[PDB]
Amino acid sequence: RPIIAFMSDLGTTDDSVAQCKGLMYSICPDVTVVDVCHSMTPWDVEEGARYIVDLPRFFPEGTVFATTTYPATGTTTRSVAVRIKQAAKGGAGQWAGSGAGFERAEGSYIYIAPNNGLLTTVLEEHGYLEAYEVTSPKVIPEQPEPTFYSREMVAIPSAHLAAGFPLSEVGRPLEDHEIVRFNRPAVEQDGEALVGVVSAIDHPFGNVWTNIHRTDLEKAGIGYGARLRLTLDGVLPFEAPLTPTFADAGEIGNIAIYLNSRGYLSIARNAASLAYPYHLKEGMSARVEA
Amino acid sequence: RPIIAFMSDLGTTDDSVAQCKGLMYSICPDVTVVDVCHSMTPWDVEEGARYIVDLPRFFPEGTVFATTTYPATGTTTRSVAVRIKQAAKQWAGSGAGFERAEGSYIYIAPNNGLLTTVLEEHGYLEAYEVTSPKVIPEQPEPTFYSREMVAIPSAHLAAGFPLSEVGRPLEDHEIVRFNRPAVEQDGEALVGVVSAIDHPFGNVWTNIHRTDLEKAGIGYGARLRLTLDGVLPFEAPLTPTFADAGEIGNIAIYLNSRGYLSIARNAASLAYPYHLKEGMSARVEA
Amino acid sequence: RPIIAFMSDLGTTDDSVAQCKGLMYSICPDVTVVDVCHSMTPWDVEEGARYIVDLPRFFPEGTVFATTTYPATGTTTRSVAVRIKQAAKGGARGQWAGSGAGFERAEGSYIYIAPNNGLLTTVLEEHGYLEAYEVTSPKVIPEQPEPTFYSREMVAIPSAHLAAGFPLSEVGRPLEDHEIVRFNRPAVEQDGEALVGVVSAIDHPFGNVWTNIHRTDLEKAGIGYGARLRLTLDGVLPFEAPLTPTFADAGEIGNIAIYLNSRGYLSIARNAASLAYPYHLKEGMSARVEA
Amino acid sequence: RPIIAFMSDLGTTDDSVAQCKGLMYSICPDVTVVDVCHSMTPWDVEEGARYIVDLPRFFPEGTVFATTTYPATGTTTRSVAVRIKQAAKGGARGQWAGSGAGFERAEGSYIYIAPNNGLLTTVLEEHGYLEAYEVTSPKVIPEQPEPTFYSREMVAIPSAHLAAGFPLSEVGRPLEDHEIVRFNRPAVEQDGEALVGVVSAIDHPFGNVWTNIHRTDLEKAGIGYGARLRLTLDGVLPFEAPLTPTFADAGEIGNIAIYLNSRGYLSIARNAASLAYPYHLKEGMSARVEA
Amino acid sequence: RPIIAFMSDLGTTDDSVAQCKGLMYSICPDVTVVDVCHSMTPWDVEEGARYIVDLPRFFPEGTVFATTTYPATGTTTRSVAVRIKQAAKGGAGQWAGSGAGFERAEGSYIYIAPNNGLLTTVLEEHGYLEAYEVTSPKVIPEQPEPTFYSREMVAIPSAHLAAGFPLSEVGRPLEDHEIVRFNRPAVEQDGEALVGVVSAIDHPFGNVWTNIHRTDLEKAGIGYGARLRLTLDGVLPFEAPLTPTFADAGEIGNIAIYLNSRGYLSIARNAASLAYPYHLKEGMSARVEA
Amino acid sequence: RPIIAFMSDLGTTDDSVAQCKGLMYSICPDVTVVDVCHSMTPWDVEEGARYIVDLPRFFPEGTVFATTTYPATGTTTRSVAVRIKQAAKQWAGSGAGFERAEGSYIYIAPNNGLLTTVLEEHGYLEAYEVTSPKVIPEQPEPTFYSREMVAIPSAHLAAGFPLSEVGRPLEDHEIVRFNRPAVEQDGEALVGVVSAIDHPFGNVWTNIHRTDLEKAGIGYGARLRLTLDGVLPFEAPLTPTFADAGEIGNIAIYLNSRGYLSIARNAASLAYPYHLKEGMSARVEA
Ligand SMILES: C[C@H]1O[C@@H](n2cnc3c(N)ncnc32)[C@H](O)[C@@H]1O
Ligand SMILES: C[C@H]1O[C@@H](n2cnc3c(N)ncnc32)[C@H](O)[C@@H]1O
Ligand SMILES: C[C@H]1O[C@@H](n2cnc3c(N)ncnc32)[C@H](O)[C@@H]1O
Ligand SMILES: C[C@H]1O[C@@H](n2cnc3c(N)ncnc32)[C@H](O)[C@@H]1O
Ligand SMILES: C[C@H]1O[C@@H](n2cnc3c(N)ncnc32)[C@H](O)[C@@H]1O
Ligand SMILES: C[C@H]1O[C@@H](n2cnc3c(N)ncnc32)[C@H](O)[C@@H]1O
Ligand SMILES: [Cl-]
Ligand SMILES: [Cl-]
């Protein structure tokens, strides 16, 4: 029972995703294609990365992740296919599922993506066992569509991998320095305050996500129940204790400062939108201190 | 051939829904997950209820409906899981339609009133709290009970985990319900609200029902005056469908697929040019 | 392993698509339902036609395409079901889709079921058809259809019977060619040495600009990759670039690229930036090309 | 104490109006310049005409109205200067303006100077005129006018000479009636017992709705204060109210009022709330009235 | 040299204001008409009031203020004309002008307005010497336009007053209880914090004005140089000392908490807009404390 | 017959401008106040400068220009008051125009660069700091120096208060100037910026001047290619006016009333449909 989990920038306004899916079911008759999302900001590899980094532990072993934003479509560039090392615990650290969670064995998931840095945080968080350039005409078209490499060089070969084509056969092995990566912005300790950035607005709720992690917090002594001052955009400070969840803020509309399901320091209002009335946005400065 | 039909307020702009689906396939390898929608206004229990209330008759017997908006996530609250009784009409499908046996569907949802109308329309045979670590995490992620307390246990139920083993039976009073706004009277006009804009067409749906109408003496021929937001008046005979208005753009006053007084333009949008909205008053007279 | 690929104007904000899907699994339990899209502008049959015309070569033979925008719901009109002839190559070069030399698809191997309102105009034009039938039989539609929901009653439902193996010729009577409603499509005019058409679509979510000037139209004027072109939009915007395979060929990020899209049509874009969104360019605007 | 009342399409965001004013005080030192408005949609002569047609009765006799939208700036066209005949009553009842029984104004006592582009169509129609002249004399316009600024060169400047006492008949040659450009205005049709016109304007900043159905048109059908009316807008909105003098007559705040505006025209509004803004009603929409 | 200072809700998009001005110059040949503003939110008498309350000290003695929003136009209602008592010092309290300012004698300005509460704060701040109902056909039309009382019952009689028509002759005297007034929202002392409201956004800068006055501040001990916490909309707190001016915030974009030229506690950014990016609005809660 | 022409960033949505005017009439009973505009983008010194630079030739001799955006309000800063020399062309008005004597106009402004282009184009005969309590308040309102340090002293100057008595003479270096962006070269294309959108018409004005053009070999007949924001290309002959384009909506490339390369549609807006903006690059080639 093979699964391909599919994350693109193709959107859902036309037949582009369906074209890829038609070919996936064509190549791997038994497959199940699960949509991750197709809504990412085009060409923003850092945003694409956040949508895929945390997926392994949720999926059955053997799952292939077809993940693509392909601004270098139709060039001489070729995709990278990697088998990861650890499925890894996550959240605000645990295995996912009922009971004590589902423990995932090492080397049980493959990502196939453009070699443009999309997989940077996947490789940082999970490690990898082996990496290959995707070049074989057994898995890609002999004459690929210049402007559709997300289909030609990701969707199509991912379905061959789902169908059982040996990963080592897709092309030559890539050395670590041949896999492109993006530079991750570092959390700064500024006196005793921690300085990062709004990493994401959490749609559709309007919760605010920072790149300040739970590990960064236990570094400066911060745990659940700590009074914090969190300044956004350099001028809007908020104040609240760190709490597990939204309803701990008290009344509806009140401010909650919490750890999100991905482990990162976040801010919201209790059953109300914070970001949307005050037009708060990704990329704004975020500062925290007790 | 187990099915989970999935309705949430998680949206489709990140991997939140995919995390839930991943766990569904892990738990029930042979499952088919059907998306209902994930677009609902966050925390609007009456809105989410509208999207799930008439689903059973359309699905194969044995379908599990996983339906969630969870603003009380991470608290001591636990989900409710119910088996409904009557799948409830006409029947849907080709010919005279497909009849559905009683007790053939399970809903699992936060215990916050989301299931209010499902229970009124269909009734139930059994209701339980979802507490067993067989079907939910021992360390549940505080901010993601739509995943922990709905998605995960729905998939155990799809795989044949016995309903009565999820936790203790709930008595009726323990099952939270929302109050639904009444259709009131002033003179011979009926006063209600706009209960929804029908995206993407811009049709207007009111809470004034077939039954409220015929009781006040209105059937499929009646010339009606329909005033919206207390300002915009519309006038037209009650008709079965849009094209009964004649010209493209003409006004149709009709009954939507739920028996509710509705208003639209024929093959054009009514709501969008006039910025008509849910929650606006709707007053009708013959 | 039967597939129904589903395209409608029902949107993704309520339970309308799910009702259709439920009834698909009810009638054909082993079916796989693949969403094409549900976002088309309601009642724009020309736009709907664009999202379904290119589908066959990507799908397994025996696939059923349920394609629907239904402004005449609740009327005496009934849907039309067609077996197409050629699965038809396509793309910028014109080839089969898939790895290696692509997946060659046999003739008469796909069914489309749709309102009889012109939605299938380009499907028939580009693929031809082998047989067409009016969808009237109570075996495949409800005896009491919901007046406002013919996308479900007259398309979703019968499509699932067809996917289950219900004989096509049994849905109702054969339709003569003149009984299949069509729309007229704009002809690219050969004006001097220029080619005059329109912006056919904005390519969401990138804001690329698609015209109705097809690759074969370009070969009427003898224009291939490397040709220095002037592509004028909206009468007043004379863009200038060589015709190149892809976006990155334009050099720096933001530079204008003139290219052939994945559907075989003359297009214009910027390299890893949006052309249509900043300047609010729209479908329907004029598009002129010349060398 | 000469007055120039000034209406243009120049806006209030730069120094364009001030340049015109400066030259007014330069040519006629004791002048008072009164802004009519500078907000009209550029080049919409019909809208401009609405802001100037009702002016004479409010102003001292001898006032000069400099009224300008000039899309043909820099061309061989020259402005036209007119002495009107009747100052003309008006308003919902039809009377003179001011305290007591109002200020009665004499015949032939106001001058309008404008581009010869139809801007003065309703002025002449409603007031008549006694003499008209092309504005050509270097005594009142520049010998080298700025190509893009004929609102200044061919209207502001000569208007200030006229206010200073420059003889009207000396600006240039007399113009025959057919030489004064006009636009055609929509005729309210007598359809059955209904009267069919349009929404002429949105009354900013209140969002009241003005139609082109005049009080005298209502008296063709015999409609006065107290008459229960149906006023249908945009073909689909049948408003119902008695015809009343004013807004508060409708009762509660927000209730629909149907009334005669201060310009003598059939209008519709809400009592101390906006009708046009919430529902995005627009000029050009249809307006039908009947009793 | 008579002056009429003219404040309406008529806007500047049509000839409505010019009609009034034509009649003003008709009635009072020597007059100068100064526009206060015509931009107010229609029918909002509290907003109209803020635009007129502070005008007397700036204008020559003898000035008439014609001030109007007239939602009761065309009814039996009649305007009120009042001679004020004190011109009054103002600002963050002084006379206006070069040197030590221009001292204005008592009873030297007249307001004419609808009797709908528009003049509430004028009468509270300045007092009055005499008040009259405007009813004489020597100053108003015998048949006034039903829908244009701002012209008929304000503009027109104001010009008669400018022209020298005796104020006592416009109609009968009104007793204090016959002059309509609006209820002013009270500043609350909530513990040691002061609770009011955003009274206005200061266009075009996007500065935020509160109804918390300098007097309210010296009541709780607050002067220039006091560290303050100011919460807006119940969730956005800001922190800054109270300073005289914007540039005291330091760098451009920094927050300044100050007293405005009208005497009220205010918040802004130094040469940047505060209200506009965060969509802050009139009517939002405002809380302050040291 | 004294005149004050008044330009500020105070807007027209409250009584800020009326307070200033009130004080002008108090100080100079016989004054005429002319509004220039009050709409300028707050604190944009180059923008406000554009609105005041060519005013003198249009006004009677003896006019005082009160011109202010004052982001440094309430600090130790004091305003500058200058008498300009050459009123500077053609001359404006009927006939051959009205010549203006030298030294006939005074500007008074914050000393923040607002007067940069006025001084470059016209020159000056004398410049002073505004410090005398004869002409400004002793207790100046900290947040309203546009009123205290511009409006009030301008009106004393209109009334005949001697210029040299406002405070001490300033040397040229004490008068703050802004740097103006240069028109540069790349190949035979000239590169500049859009210096303004011409509201309300939506015409586009560039900083590429008549002089920059003719030096590169371009006159009133030249077919030019004009690219805006680095993306949108336009092509058209250089013409005197809009109507030279022919059809309504056609493209005109012309010189605005300041000698600057400009682009527009004939009797339609160019900037608004395309969302063209000030600060966007403008590149021209013959
Ligand atoms: C197949 C890939 O083409 C890329 N793509 C789409 N449009 C552009 C563009 N204008 N420039 C560069 N890349 C683009 C998308 O990222 C898609 O994933
Ligand atoms: C897992 C559940 O978390 C809830 N959720 C998301 N954001 C908030 C918030 N600010 N307050 C309360 N609940 C929230 C959603 O309703 C989702 O269904
Ligand atoms: C079931 C079908 O109903 C059609 N539909 C929905 N709303 C309208 C309307 N206002 N007018 C005409 N057709 C409509 C949709 O096109 C859908 O496909
Ligand atoms: C003469 C006065 O008419 C008032 N006015 C304008 N429109 C309305 C309306 N729709 N309802 C009530 N009053 C209105 C304005 O406030 C103006 O000042
Ligand atoms: C009196 C002067 O005050 C200035 N002004 C108004 N708001 C601000 C602010 N937030 N920062 C700096 N200056 C400001 C204006 O520029 C006005 O001209
Ligand atoms: C001096 C006159 O210039 C006219 N004007 C300004 N811009 C344009 C344009 N793009 N097209 C035509 N006329 C224009 C205005 O209407 C003004 O009145
Ligand atoms: Cl799916
Ligand atoms: Cl004025």
Annotate D47-84 with DSSP letters as a single string.
Answer: HHHHTTTT-GGGS-TT-EEEEE--TTTTSS---EEEEE
**d(Cα E240, Cα E242) in Å, to the nearest integer?**
7
Q: Are residues F123 and F85 in contact, defined by beta-carbon separation less than 8 angstroms?
A: yes
Q: In this structure, what DSSP letter does residue C263 have?
A: T
Q: Is C95 on the interface with A (CB under 8 A)?
A: yes
Closest ligand to residue E24's CA: 8
Q: Cite the annotated binding site of E by residue number.
A: 9, 14-16, 70, 150, 202, 207, 261-262, 269-271
Residues B198, C14: C-beta atoms closer than 8 Å: yes
D88 burial via Cβ count (<10 Å: 0-12, 13-18, 19+):
middle
Check pocket membership of C36 for ligand 1, CB cut-off 6 A.
no
Q: How far is CA E132 from the centre of its chain?
A: 21
Q: Is D278 on the interface with F (CB under 8 A)?
A: no
Residues E238, A238: C-beta atoms closer than 8 Å: no
Do at least 3 CB pairs under 8 Å connect D with A? no
Pocket lining for ligand 3, CB < 6 angstroms: B 201, 203, 242, 264-267; C 9, 42-43, 68-71, 73, 148-151
The alpha carbon of B44 and the centre of ligand 2 are apart by a number of angstroms equal to 11
Q: Is D205 on the interface with E (CB under 8 A)?
A: yes
Q: Is A203 on the interface with B (CB under 8 A)?
A: yes
Q: How far is CA B118 from the centre of its chain?
A: 8
| Residues facing F254 on adjacent strands | F239, F262
Structure tokens that stand for D149 in this block: 């600024």
* Fold type of domain E1-184: Rossmann fold (3.40.50)
Architecture (CATH level 2) of domain F181-286: Beta Barrel (2.40)
Polymer length of chain E: 290
Structure tokens that stand for E270 in this block: 């130094």
The domains spanning A1-184 and A185-290 adopt the same CATH topology: no
Q: DSSP letters along E165-226, please? A: --GGGSSPBPPGGGS--PPPPPPEEETTEEEEEEEEEETTTTEEEEEEEHHHHHHTT--TT-
Do at least 3 CB pairs under 8 Å connect D with B? yes
Opening angle at CA F20, ends F16 and F24, nearest 5 = 165
**d(Cα A3, Cα A19) in Å, to the nearest integer?**
17
Tell me the Cα Rg of chain E: 21
The alpha carbon of B34 and the centre of ligand 7 are apart by a number of angstroms equal to 7
Helix (H) or strand (E) holding F219, with range, is none
Tell me which chain A residues have a C-beta less than 8 angstroms from the C-beta of E236. Answer: 236, 238, 278
Name chain A's partners: 3 or more CB pairs within 8 A.
B, C, E
Closest ligand to residue B264's CA: 3
Cα distances (angstroms) measured from residue E264 to each of A210, E209, E227, E237, F143? 36, 7, 17, 18, 12
Check pocket membership of A68 for ligand 1, CB cut-off 6 A.
yes
Tell me which chain D residues have a C-beta less than 8 angstroms from the C-beta of F3. Answer: 25
**d(Cα A178, Cα A166) in Å, to the nearest integer?**
21
**d(Cα C265, Cα C268) in Å, to the nearest integer?**
10
Polymer length of chain C: 291
Helices E156-163 and E16-27: angle between axes, nearest 10 degrees: 30
Tell me the Cα Rg of chain F: 21
**d(Cα B43, Cα B47) in Å, to the nearest integer?**
9
Mutate to test the pocket of ligand 4, among E15, E40, E73, E116 (most ligand atoms within 8 A of CB): E73
Tell me which chain A residues have a C-beta less than 8 angstroms from the C-beta of C247. Answer: 71, 73-74, 147
Q: What is the largest CA-CA distance in chain E?
A: 61
CATH of domain C186-291: 2.40.30.90
Tell me which chain A residues have a C-beta less than 8 angstroms from the C-beta of B139. Answer: 94, 100-101
Nearest atom in ligand 1 to C274's CA: 10
Check pocket membership of E246 for ligand 5, CB cut-off 6 A.
yes
Provide the resolution (angstroms).
Answer: 2.0
Q: How was this structure determined?
A: X-ray
Q: Is C52 on the interface with A (CB under 8 A)?
A: yes
Number of Cβ pairs < 8 A linking chain B and chain D: 30
Nearest atom in ligand 5 to F147's CA: 1
A225 burial via Cβ count (<10 Å: 0-12, 13-18, 19+):
exposed
Task: Say yes or no: domain B1-180 is CATH 3.40.50.2300.
Answer: no
The half-sphere exposure of B265 on its side-chain side, counting CA atoms within 13 A, is: 22
Structure tokens that stand for C95 in this block: 């080839």
Check pocket membership of D70 for ligand 6, CB cut-off 6 A.
yes
Ligand 3, atom 1, lies closest to the CA of C149
Domain locations along chain B: 1-180, 181-286
Q: Is C57 on the interface with B (CB under 8 A)?
A: no
Ligand 4, atom 1, lies closest to the CA of E148
Mutate to test the pocket of ligand 5, among E208, E238, E243, E246 (most ligand atoms within 8 A of CB): E246
Cα distances (angstroms) measured from residue E277 to each of A209, A255, E232, F284? 19, 20, 14, 35
Of A21, A138, A143, which is closest to C93 when you measure between CB atoms? A143
Residue of B nearest to A4 (CA): B22
How far does B186 lie from chain A, in Å, by closest CA?
35
Residues F134, E98: C-beta atoms closer than 8 Å: yes
Amino acid at D172: G
Task: Say yes or no: domain C1-185 is CATH 3.40.50.10790.
Answer: yes
Cα distances (angstroms) measured from residue A206 to each of A282, D260, E131? 11, 48, 55
A204: cis peptide before it, omega within 30°? yes
* Fold type of domain A185-290: Elongation Factor Tu (Ef-tu); domain 3 (2.40.30)
Closest ligand to residue A203's CA: 2
Q: Is E22 on the interface with A (CB under 8 A)?
A: no
Q: In this structure, what DSSP letter does residue A236 have?
A: E
Helix (H) or strand (E) holding F225, with range, is strand F223-228
Measure CA of the first residue to CA of the last residue in chain D; give whole Å. Answer: 50
Do at least 3 CB pairs under 8 Å connect A with E? yes
**d(Cα E104, Cα E85) in Å, to the nearest integer?**
11
**d(Cα E224, Cα E214) in Å, to the nearest integer?**
10
Structure tokens that stand for B119 in this block: 């229970």
| Helix ranges restricted to H, B189-258 | 210-216
CB-based contacts of A165, cutoff 8 Å, min separation 6: A138, A139
Structure tokens that stand for C73 in this block: 């719901």
**d(Cα B206, Cα B184) in Å, to the nearest integer?**
13
Q: Are residues B1 and B30 in contact, defined by beta-carbon separation less than 8 angstroms?
A: yes
Pocket lining for ligand 4, CB < 6 angstroms: D 206, 208, 247, 269-272; E 9, 42-43, 68-71, 73, 147-150
**d(Cα D69, Cα D83) in Å, to the nearest integer?**
20
Nearest atom in ligand 3 to C16's CA: 1
Q: Are residues D169 and D181 in contact, defined by beta-carbon separation less than 8 angstroms?
A: no
Helices A16-27 and A156-163: angle between axes, nearest 10 degrees: 30
Q: Checking DSSP bridges between strand E227-232 and strand E207-213, what pairing results, if any?
A: unpaired
**Which of residues 250 through 269 in chain F touch C, CB cutoff 8 A?**
250-251, 265
Per-residue exposure over B105-143, b if at least 16 CB sit within 10 Å of its own CB, e if not: bbbbbbbbbbbbbbbeebebeebbbbebeebbbeebbbb
Ligand 1, atom 1, lies closest to the CA of A148
Helix (H) or strand (E) holding D19, with range, is helix D16-27
Closest ligand to residue B11's CA: 2
Nearest atom in ligand 4 to E42's CA: 16
**d(Cα E80, Cα E272) in Å, to the nearest integer?**
42
